[PDB]
Ligand binder design. Structure first.
Ligand code: ZN
Ligand code: ZN
Ligand code: ZN
Length: 80
């Protein structure tokens, strides 16, 4: 069905911190990281979807739904 001004399937950089409500890209507003990741076709997703960028924390980062890429051998917590 119909959609607003956010029809770009790429993501914004600032996630939860993006300040514009009409902004053109997908935004991670929720703590859920997406099942389809960057191959996801959903404009309606509030979930974490990746961006081609290097994270500010790398191996020190513990954000499950983070916007930027992380190095090999990095660990993240789970409850499973
Ligand atoms: Zn934005
Ligand atoms: Zn998605
Ligand atoms: Zn990160």
């Amino acid at each position: 069905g119909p959609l607003g001004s956010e029809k770009s399937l790429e993501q914004c950089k600032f996630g939860t911190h993006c300040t514009n409500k009409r902004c053109k890209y997908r935004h991670a507003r929720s703590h859920i990281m997406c099942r389809e990741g960057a191959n996801c076709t959903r404009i309606d997703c509030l979930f974490g979807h990746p961006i081609n960028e290097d994270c500010r924390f790398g191996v020190n980062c513990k954000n499950i739904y983070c916007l930027f890429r992380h190095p090999p051998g990095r660990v993240l917590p789970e409850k499973k």
